Design a protein around this ligand. Structure first.
Ligand code: PLP
Ligand code: PLP
Lengths: 415, 415
């Protein structure tokens, strides 16, 4: 890392936008892979909605309706879902989180497409929300759950892709970026083999949408999901994008108010996409604030965010490599980590590491990070995990490193 | 209505707590049956969460965890779910809205309990979200959907309850209060016959929780759902309560992160209730603000809210009865309406009524109100609907009445 790069991450042009960080200047929040901190404008956008256009033909209702549509368009443009050049706003579906979006896909796409003997292929890197819905629908449909495995560099090889995704595959669902390893998978290449085999491509983008360019048209996926709260938006909002023809073909998930066109005692006619997939009163204020988060990120420029986060990831990994008592659970190259770096202090339980780090005002995660099959594959029962965002800086990372030296002094070999 | 009662509703001790009402003094918001307006403290409680304890072992995470638990307890106490005297906080499950809670119940309780030939009994008054999930699970399980019908006073009689809920019944799901008629159904009496017949009792309390005392122990229901946004809370938060033994018996609905205890490549062990039913990152800030709404309502005293809303409902119905060109779709007695009064201007489409009312700064709903089978039963294709909350006053209702006289001048018989 050059002097110029180190100077760039020593500077912090962004943290002042986050009230909780300004109010807590001592805290090094290194757990953005669990959830983002909130820009002031996103917090206020939610309150403004409630103060000025709160409603579910009168003006406040017209106003709330237009706010939802404008946020859908912003979200679509953010992920490259554009025609014309018009945003594909009607291919944007709201959920509570990525987890609900993946349950929706597994139920709806699974019922639509899976026959007994079909394969559903996922990776060993998947978060639990891109695992258990597939366990469940596979049992219900007679399909088989297949796993893509990793090589010694924590990657999925082209050879593994061709070996595991064969003619029996019907759905393939893979994380764009692992929330533990930080590995960025070659989703476009996986999609190519998936489609050759007559299968649909599902992408868990919860860890990519905050960090790297997501373009659904370039990725060639059929469905893609992420969570607003991991990209500076509010909690309570997840996004599902899908190809228009496929969403039309897929059956509804939740049923009830607002997702119908008409109802009788015995049956119902469904509304068009995306209302077909949105049952009952939606979180209009959260949707509105998700649009505000998108506008906020666009204003900072995602290319500048990515450049800064790349430098922070490189610095984090570099500094962890100077501690010989630290085992990095993942690649030892910082450029191979998008956002997340998992690690252990050798001989010390992550609960104890995190406790000492918290006493030093450093926030990390300890445990299996909702990727237990991955940790089992890696012969770990738990790890620490530090993660970086553009509102972090070099000093946050140095604080972590100083904390880990304190851990080693308290629990290390000398004791 | 006595002079004292009229004076009570002419006074408005509550509207100043609602920023959108203070900022829009001309507007008569008579659509609280669709969603509440937000007290200032509830809007600010959500922002405060994000500003001060935003996280998903470090302090902000401990703090967010304790906030969720404290809101669960407040909610449990609000609906009478108390031991000891301890709130049954672990029987409180969060969803996005009543609609998702009812889909959860229909899927989970339906898979658990329904055999082919069983009856599911609902009422003709149900909102679509307490209809279509039952259509769906009945088809999947071989059960039959049965409807409780009304008499000429818009009530369900004891004779109808005994006639339709027989030994084949396995699940009965009924609205506590109709969102169209304002009829309060005798849920406790329905529950008694339901249980005699070996069936489970489900209650849609979305229109009762904002207005009348809800005590799950006195109602004798097995499951009960409502929406925070209809009782001065934020959007995005629904509540499901269930008997502890039954929630334990019921299978999970959504699966994935946070609702497990452990996961392998092929299977999973579920977490205890209520985490078993909460998949992925929850809307902690919305949960927190829902607790704030409960505290706000408790501070006003629900008994005083109910007394005031009873007087407003009586006045609304009384004044509508003075307009001979208005047909009330429901009881002509104001005391038979909890919150909602549906009506039509004879010979005028509700879209036109609502449009003129909006030009007069009156907000009502027009259409089928997500209860189309009810309107079909009543030989209506659409109605108007005005609804009252404690932050309304006599002047709001007089504004509606003046607006309806304008409608009659523009579209009535003379034209
Ligand atoms: C955290 C995460 C999820 C789950 O997101 P929720 O918002 O909690 O539903 C899914 N996949 C990945 C890769 C994640 O990092
Ligand atoms: C509005 C309402 C519902 C639906 O509530 P959501 O919050 O939109 O899911 C269900 N039942 C009744 C009686 C309602 O009034």
């Amino acid at each position: 890392m050059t002097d110029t790069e180190v100077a760039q991450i020593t500077d912090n042009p962004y943290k002042a936008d986050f009230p909780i960080l300004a109010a807590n200047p001592k805290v090094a929040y290194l757990d953005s892979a669990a959830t983002s901190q909130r820009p002031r404008v996103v917090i206020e956008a939610q309150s403004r909605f409630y103060e000025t256009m709160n409603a579910n033909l009168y003006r406040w209702s017209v106003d709330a309706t237009a706010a939802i549509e404008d946020a859908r368009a912003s979200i679509a443009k953010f992920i490259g879902a554009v025609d014309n050049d018009k945003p594909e706003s009607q291919q944007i579906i709201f959920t509570r989180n990525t987890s609900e979006a993946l349950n929706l896909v597994a139920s709806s796409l699974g019922r639509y497409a899976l026959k007994p003997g079909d394969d559903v292929v996922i990776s060993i890197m998947e978060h639990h929300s891109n695992i258990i819905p597939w366990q469940q629908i596979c049992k219900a449909t007679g399909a088989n759950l297949v796993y893509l495995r990793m090589n010694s560099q924590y990657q999925i090889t082209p050879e593994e892709i061709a070996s595991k995704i064969t003619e029996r595959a019907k759905i393939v669902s893979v994380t764009h970026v692992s929330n533990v390893l930080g590995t960025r998978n070659d989703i476009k290449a996986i999609a190519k083999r998936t489609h050759a085999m007559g299968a649909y491509m599902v992408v868990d983008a919860a860890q990519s949408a905050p960090h790297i360019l997501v373009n659904v048209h370039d990725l060639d996926c059929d469905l893609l999901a992420f969570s607003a709260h991991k990209m500076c938006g509010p909690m309570g909002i997840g996004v599902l994008w899908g190809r228009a023809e496929l969403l039309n073909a897929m059956p509804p998930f939740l049923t009830g108010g607002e997702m119908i066109d008409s109802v009788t005692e015995t049956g119902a006619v469904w509304a068009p996409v995306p209302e077909k997939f949105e049952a009952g009163t939606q979180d209009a204020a959260g949707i509105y604030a998700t649009g505000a988060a998108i506008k906020y990120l666009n204003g900072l420029d995602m290319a500048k965010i990515e450049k800064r986060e790349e430098l922070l990831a490189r610095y984090l990994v570099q500094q962890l490599c100077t501690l010989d008592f630290v085992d990095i659970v993942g690649s030892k190259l910082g450029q191979n980590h998008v956002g997340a770096v998992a690690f252990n202090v050798r001989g010390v339980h992550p609960h104890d590491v995190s406790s000492i780090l918290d006493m030093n005002n450093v926030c990390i995660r300890a445990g299996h990070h909702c990727a237990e099959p991955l940790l089992i594959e890696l012969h770990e029962s738990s790890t620490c995990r530090a993660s970086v965002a553009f509102y972090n800086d070099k000093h946050d990372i140095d604080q972590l490193i100083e904390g880990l030296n304190q851990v080693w002094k308290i629990f290390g070999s000398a004791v």
